[PDB]
Amino acid sequence: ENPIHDRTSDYHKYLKVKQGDSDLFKLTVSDKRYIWYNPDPKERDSYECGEIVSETSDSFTFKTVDGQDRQVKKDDANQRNPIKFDGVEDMSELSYLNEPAVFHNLRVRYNQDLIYTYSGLFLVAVNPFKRIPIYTQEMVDIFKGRRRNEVAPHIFAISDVAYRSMLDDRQNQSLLITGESGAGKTENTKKVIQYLASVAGRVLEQQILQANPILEAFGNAKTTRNNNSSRFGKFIEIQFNSAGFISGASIQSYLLEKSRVVFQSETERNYHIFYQLLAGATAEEKKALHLAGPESFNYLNQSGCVDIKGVSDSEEFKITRQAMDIVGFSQEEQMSIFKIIAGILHLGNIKFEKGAGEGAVLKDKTALNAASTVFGVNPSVLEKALMEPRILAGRDLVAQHLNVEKSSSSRDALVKALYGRLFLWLVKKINNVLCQERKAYFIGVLDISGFEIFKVNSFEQLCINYTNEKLQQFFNHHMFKLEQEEYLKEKINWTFIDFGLDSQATIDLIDGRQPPGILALLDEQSVFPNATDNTLITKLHSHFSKKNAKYEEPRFSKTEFGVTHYAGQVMYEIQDWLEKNKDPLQQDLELCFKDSSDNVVTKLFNDPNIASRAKKGANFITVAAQYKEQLASLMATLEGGGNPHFVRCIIPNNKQLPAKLEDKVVLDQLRCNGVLEGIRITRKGFPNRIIYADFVKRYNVPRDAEDSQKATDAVLKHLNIDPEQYRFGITKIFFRAGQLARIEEAREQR
Ligand SMILES: OC[C@H]1O[C@H](O)[C@H](O)[C@@H](O)[C@@H]1O
Ligand SMILES: [Mg+2]
């Protein structure tokens, strides 16, 4: 009748704790007390359960699994919770809050394939690495309209709360999904969009859903940490009208890792689309675009990996096209896109060799010709733009003759420019389909590239990790600093707590303007004509080595520097940072391609939104300077809207495998995310607070008395409730954890 109360239901099967049996009940009513302890003290995250057998005034004595006795100061003891709590849906409710206790609860739920658990006001999501049947339309219909208490933890539930808050307060909402690479941010992002598309839907809705398949084909790739890594960040606005139904959507993408098109580490892959087309193209297309297998192209055959376990690139290519068909990309538009993808691969097979002099020559023109043909440009113009670009020397026109290395770098620069502009064009084309009505409100979903560490971390990794560092500070800001400052404002005689979670020092080291940080010193070096990679790291060491605690000059290298992030220390290799920040492209290469006969290619080099570049003084804006501002604008939106809804995505292990929840990996993320601290603030504080005059409004009789703090003093007193669970502020009635949601449902039943 109602699937929630029906133990036969799929909702009870896949989203509720299984019923315990008679044997477990006898354990549950037992009076024995237990403790989480470390059998091996060096391994501080590995725990066993031990029974407390005696206690002194200041310590517990307990029995290990093997039978030996041990003591522990009660101040240092991690008590196990009464097992009745095992599986609790909100860990606010736990009696003992400690790392082994919190981890254990998630383990119990994970083992039953319950990946969602609440931690007070935010949702925790552990990556299952297997399909779970909790995202059907049936499950959507169940969560539709239900308040957070009534239903089990689900991404739908927090999406619904954000949707109801948008309309109850007439304010834009932010759903921010944190996590390191592979933790599940993109999967959950898509579930949020699925839910709101049906709950407030009315082909627009089909098209919204088809956008992300397109961008994942061109923006996602296999890394060592995730087989479907997002190599670009995205803020997605879901837009609604004043009535509350979907009006449209816009996507704001950030920092495509276009360097991946020309280089990939061992075991990795280029962007999916390359493998999709060559695998799934018709015989006409393969000849039209001079295609081959991935082993035939240098951009696809140097990593040693061309396929992903459990993925058919031939089938994904069918999926990719259908999404383009539904969104409205024409047949010749799509063919122009594939011509570009094809041309990039051919450009990469060009082999520059040494000529009679140091200047480079091109003895085989088979790749250049195939590229020129598909792009629709003059091969000899292109050839001369690659190896003989014209520059100005003062005002004089002088033709370079580049060597093999610099000819190869310019060709790479062209390839990364073509791919990044194609990606920006896809986003823009899509936004114009999905945005045809002035919004009334929106819910903005943030899905960034998550924290990652590799053997070699470069400029791209610092920008990625810096963004992850800023979102964590945003979480710290709202849960700890803003929460308490509202308490202080209302004079509830709360004395401040230091939760020891501040990412700001690391943030300032990266992006401070004065004292100038890494990104400022980078910019300075990028416009100085005698600068090199080694004058840059020398400058970074002098400013920060042994002067900033978040910075390390390593003793084992002369090209690496270490940044201590919330998620751990990262060591960055400085090679090529100047060129990556400047993002140069020979103008002769640009001139060649604006004469292209392909209408998509000509748009990528003539549309000023895609092709032109902002000047900050005498030079072009750098990549660092632009992105920093792009992100600052995004942060302004998030802080300007309603309070953010947080989903902390958690990776169970580093092997991308199901049913292996590892203790060290999980507790690392729980500590640096500030989960336990986020629980503590909810328990020790007053999360639910209400304006006096309208508490009576929603629930000597109650309503519109001259002053309601006098009234509610009476309402609560006459009523059956303790006065430690509320506090009288200047303008609000603060409530302790749970009181409001606990009580008013008796008002819902009365
Ligand atoms: O929350 C109380 C419920 O009943 C009433 O109809 C309210 O107006 C509506 O907001 C909700 O459906
Ligand atoms: Mg992702």
Numbering used by the authors: 1 to 202, 210 to 706, 712 to 762
Paper text:
The ATP-driven mutual interplay between myosin and actin drives muscle contraction and many other forms of cellular motility, including cytokinesis and directional cargo transport; yet, our molecular understanding of how these two cytoskeletal proteins communicate with each to generate force still remains incomplete. With the aid of mutant analyses based on kinetic investigations and simulations, we identified the W-helix as an important hub coupling the structural changes of switch elements during ATP hydrolysis to temporally controlled interactions with actin that are passed to the central transducer and converter. A critical role in controlling the sequence of events associated with force production appears to be played by the W-helix, which we propose to act as kind of communication zone in the inner myosin core for coupling conformational rearrangements upon nucleotide binding to cleft closure-induced β-sheet distortions by putting a stress on β1 to β3 of the central transducer; this is important to temporally couple weak-to-strong actin-binding transitions to the initiation of the power stroke and release of hydrolysis products. To gain mechanistic insights into the proposed role of the W-helix/transducer region in mediating actin binding to product release, we followed a mutational approach and replaced the two hotspot threonines in the W-loop of the myosin-2 motor domain from D. discoideum by either two alanines (AA) or three glycines (GGG) in order to reduce the rigidity of that region during weak-to-strong transition without dramatically disturbing the fold of the protein.
Replacing the two W-loop residues by three glycines in M765GGG was expected to affect loop flexibility more drastically than with the double-alanine mutant construct M765AA. The superimposed structures reveal that the mutants crystallized in the pre-power-stroke state adopting the same overall conformation as previously reported for the wildtype. Characteristic features of this pre-power-stroke state are the partially open actin-binding cleft, the up position of the converter, and the relay helix in a bent conformation. Only minor structural deviations from the wild-type conformation can be observed for the mutants concerning the β3, β5, and β7 strands of the central transducer, which are slightly shifted, as well as the relay helix conformation. The high resemblance of the wild-type and mutant structures, which are representative for the actin-detached conformation of myosin just prior to Pi release, and actin-rebinding suggest that the mutations have no or only a minor impact on ATP turnover if actin is absent, consistent with our hypothesis that the W-helix primarily mediates the communication between active site elements and the actin-binding region.
